[PDB]
Amino acid sequence: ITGTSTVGVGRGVLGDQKNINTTYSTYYYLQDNTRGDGIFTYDAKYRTTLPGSLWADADNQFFASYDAPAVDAHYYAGVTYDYYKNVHNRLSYDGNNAAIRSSVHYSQGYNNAFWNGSEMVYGDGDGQTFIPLSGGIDVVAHELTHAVTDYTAGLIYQNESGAINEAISDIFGTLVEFYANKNPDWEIGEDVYTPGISGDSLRSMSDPAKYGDPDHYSKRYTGTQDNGGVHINSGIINKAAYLISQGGTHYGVSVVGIGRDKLGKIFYRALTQYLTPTSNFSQLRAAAVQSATDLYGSTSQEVASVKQAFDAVGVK
């Protein structure tokens, strides 16, 4: 919409107050003109037609319960955009400031969120398993990272390339969470998962097994469920990333951590320069090793840690 850029105020899913960039033209719209070609948030109104209506509000104040998921989706998309721009020098998901669109209130009691190849979509959850999914910054960052992957590696969403695709989204979803410094951790979905249970999460990068996911290649899922286990086998790569960054001993193999910033640098380089649509775990290892070499030299500790971490999870 064409209008005047302004700043509204609202309350997110978790009840936190935050300012949001809006656009004024009769109504105040959830349209952020300060980042690239814009961030647009839509109301799917409990239906499945996308994107729905660009979010319109009469007074630029978003404190209604219906508003919460929109506020967070809009706000976190902005934070995610800043992360990629500031940390990786990437302008939006396509690298050329493509408009970022998100739709909230998708369907009824929908326990998921996803990138559909064109935009991000967020369900409200059923109130038991999940609350509105945009309330989690690792969720929002996970979805937008899928867009980055679409325009770079193009990892096919099935089997090993699919598990890599998922892991990259969890890895960057986590790095964005640390970046915003929003009670950061190496857990996935803790802010919106199971409102009745404290201390849990959907997945864990530090200890995937905690939630039944493999933490070693020998325990990989080989069936056809979940597109060949894309949300299951991602645990193997998530664990490796966690080890590269934080260090630790896993299955008797010791890894010296090199930190989050270097983890992000290595993986971003692998994703954008070396990964292809059909890359498997073994190729991811080679890509990560090559990236760390380009950035830190063949005899660097960084290259050594990447090797140890993949050895620890059994990926040669």
Ligand X SMILES: CCCCC[C@H](S)C(=O)N[C@@H](Cc1ccccc1)C(=O)N[C@@H](C)C(=O)O
Which amino acids are annotated as binding site for Zn(2+), given as ranges? 142, 146, 166
Report in angstroms how near the CB of residue 111 gets to ligand X at its nearest: 7
Q: Which residue among 119, 160, 187, 311 contacts Ca ion (CB under 5 A)?
A: 187
The alpha carbon of 58 is separated from its chain's Cα centroid by a whole number of angstroms, namely 31
> Binding mask 142-181 vs Ca ion (x if CB under 5 A, - otherwise)?
-----------------------------------x----
**Among this protein's residues, is 231 annotated catalytic?**
yes
Residues that bind ligand X (CB under 6 A): 112-115, 136, 138-139, 142-143, 146, 173, 188-189, 202, 231
124 binds, among Zn ion, Ca ion, ligand X, none (CB under 5 to 8 A by kind): none
Q: How many residues bind Ca ion (CB under 5 A)?
A: 12
- Examine residue 193 and tell whether it contacts Ca ion (CB under 5 A): yes
Side-chain-side CA neighbours of 15 within 13 Å: the count stands at 0
Angle, nearest 10°, between helix axes 159-180 and 281-296? 40
218 binds, among Ca ion, ligand X, Zn ion, none (CB under 5 to 8 A by kind): none
Find the residue with minimal CB distance to ligand X.
189
**Among this protein's residues, is 105 annotated catalytic?**
no
Please say which residue, 200 or 294, places its beta carbon nearer to Ca ion: 200
147 binds, among Ca ion, ligand X, Zn ion, none (CB under 5 to 8 A by kind): none
197 binds, among ligand X, Zn ion, Ca ion, none (CB under 5 to 8 A by kind): Ca ion
Report in angstroms how near the CB of residue 116 gets to ligand X at its nearest: 8
SS3 sequence of the chain: CCCEEEEEEEECCCCCEEEEEEEEECEEECEECCCCCCEEEEECCCCCCCCCEECEECCCEECCCCCHHHHHHHHHHHHHHHHHHHHHCCCCCCCCCCCEEEEECCCCCCCCEEECCCCEEECCCCCCCECCHHHCHHHHHHHHHHHHHHHCCCCCCCHHHHHHHHHHHHHHHHHHHHHHCCCCCCEECCCCECCCCCCCCCEECCCHHHHCCCCCHHHCCCCCHHHHHCCCCHHHHHHHHHHHHHCEEECCEEECCCCHHHHHHHHHHHHHHHCCCCCCHHHHHHHHHHHHHHHHCCCCHHHHHHHHHHHHCCCC
183 binds, among Ca ion, ligand X, Zn ion, none (CB under 5 to 8 A by kind): Ca ion
202 binds, among Ca ion, ligand X, Zn ion, none (CB under 5 to 8 A by kind): ligand X
Residues 226-236: b if buried by 16+ CB within 10 A, e if exposed: bbbbbbbbbbb
Per-residue tokens: 30: 């959830």
- Examine residue 26 and tell whether it contacts Ca ion (CB under 5 A): no
Please say which residue, 36 or 235, places its beta carbon nearer to ligand X: 235
Q: Are the beta carbons of 104 and 120 closer than 8 angstroms?
A: no
Report in angstroms how near the CB of residue 146 gets to Zn ion at its nearest: 6
**Which residue out of 119, 143, 160, 302 is catalytically annotated?**
143
φ, ψ at 107 (rounded to 5°): 60, -165
Please say which residue, 190 or 311, places its beta carbon nearer to Ca ion: 190
**Which residue out of 74, 216, 231, 250 is catalytically annotated?**
231
Please say which residue, 67 or 160, places its beta carbon nearer to Ca ion: 67
Q: Which residue among 16, 37, 57, 207 contacts Ca ion (CB under 5 A)?
A: 57
Please say which residue, 21 or 169, places its beta carbon nearer to Zn ion: 169
Find the residue with minimal CB distance to Zn ion.
169
Supply the residues annotated as catalytic. Answer: 143, 231
